[PDB]
C-alpha cells in the first residue's frame, strides 16, 4: 500500500492495484507532516507524474466492472468505416442511454 | 457467405438471403484493406448495382417476417378499384398505425 506523506513511495502499481473506492479513504487518512530527508528520485514534481499513471489505468479496470452495464461503443465520427464505397461512415452524436437491464 | 473485401463475390442471391438486421453488423466489422487482384465483370460501379438489388429485393423478406403485424395495403389513390360505374374509387391516406396485436 502506498504512503501519501512520502515522496519516494507512490508508484504506478500502488495506485492501480488499490481500488477507486479504496483510493478515496487512503489519501484522506494520511499525515499532514511532509518528510524531506529522503526524496523522490525524479524530484518533488516528478512524483506527481507517477501518481497520475495509476488513475488513468484505473478507469479501464472500472470499465470492466461496468462492462455488463453498457454496450460496445460504435464510432462517433465519420471517416471510420470498413465499407466506404457503397455507404458513408456514420458518426454517433451519442445521445443514447448506455444501459443494460 | 459473401466476402466484403473482394468485390468479385457480391451477387443478388447472396444478399437477399441475408436479412437487413445482420447487414448492419457485417458492413462495420469487415476488413479495411480493399483488395484488387480479382475485379468485377460489370465493373466496380456494377458491383454496387449488384449490391443494391440484393438489398431492395431483400425488403420483401424483412416485411414477410412482419406479415402478422401490418394491415392490408389500402388503395392510396383513386383509379384502384374494380366497380366504377356507380361509386368512385377511393384513395385512402395511409396515415394510420399499421399494427395488429
Amino acid at each position: 500500500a502506498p504512503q501519501f506523506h512520502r515522496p519516494s513511495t507512490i508508484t504506478a502499481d500502488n495506485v492501480r492495484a488499490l481500488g477507486m473506492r479504496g483510493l478515496v479513504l487512503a489519501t484522506n487518512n494520511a499525515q499532514f507532516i511532509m518528510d524531506n530527508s529522503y526524496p523522490h528520485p525524479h524530484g518533488t514534481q516528478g512524483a506527481v507524474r507517477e501518481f497520475l499513471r495509476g488513475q488513468a489505468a484505473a478507469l479501464t479496470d472500472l470499465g470492466v466492472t461496468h462492462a455488463n452495464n453498457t454496450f460496445a461503443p460504435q464510432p462517433m465520427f465519420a471517416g471510420d468505416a470498413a465499407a466506404e464505397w457503397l455507404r458513408p461512415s456514420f458518426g454517433l452524436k451519442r445521445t443514447y442511454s448506455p444501459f443494460v437491464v | 457467405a459473401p466476402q466484403f473485401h473482394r468485390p468479385s463475390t457480391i451477387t443478388a442471391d447472396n444478399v437477399r438471403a441475408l436479412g437487413m438486421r445482420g447487414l448492419v453488423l457485417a458492413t462495420n466489422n469487415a476488413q479495411f484493406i480493399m483488395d484488387n487482384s480479382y475485379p468485377h465483370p460489370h465493373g466496380t460501379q456494377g458491383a454496387v448495382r449488384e449490391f443494391l438489388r440484393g438489398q431492395a429485393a431483400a425488403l420483401t423478406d424483412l416485411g414477410v417476417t412482419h406479415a402478422n403485424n401490418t394491415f392490408a395495403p389500402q388503395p392510396m389513390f383513386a383509379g384502384d378499384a374494380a366497380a366504377e360505374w356507380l361509386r368512385p374509387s377511393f384513395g385512402l391516406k395511409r396515415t394510420y398505425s399499421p399494427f395488429v396485436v
Binding site: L86, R87, P88 | V48, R49, L52, M76, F77, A78, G79, D80, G91
Partner: protein, 49 residues
C-alpha cells in the same frame, strides 16, 4: 412522380400548368427569402443513398 404508377406517363402529365410555376415560386423566391446567401444544392449518389 405521380400517384398512379399503374397509369404511367412518358408524354401526358398529371400536374396542372401552375405546378412547376409554384415550384418556381417556392424555389427561386421563398428559399432566397430565408437564405441570405446560405443554401446550396446537392448531387445525389442514390446508390449510396
Amino acid at each position: 412522380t405521380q400517384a398512379r404508377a399503374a397509369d404511367a406517363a412518358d408524354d401526358r402529365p398529371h400536374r396542372p400548368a401552375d405546378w412547376t410555376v409554384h415550384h418556381k415560386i417556392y424555389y427561386y423566391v421563398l428559399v432566397p427569402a430565408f437564405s441570405r446567401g446560405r443554401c446550396c444544392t446537392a448531387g445525389v449518389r442514390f446508390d449510396r443513398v
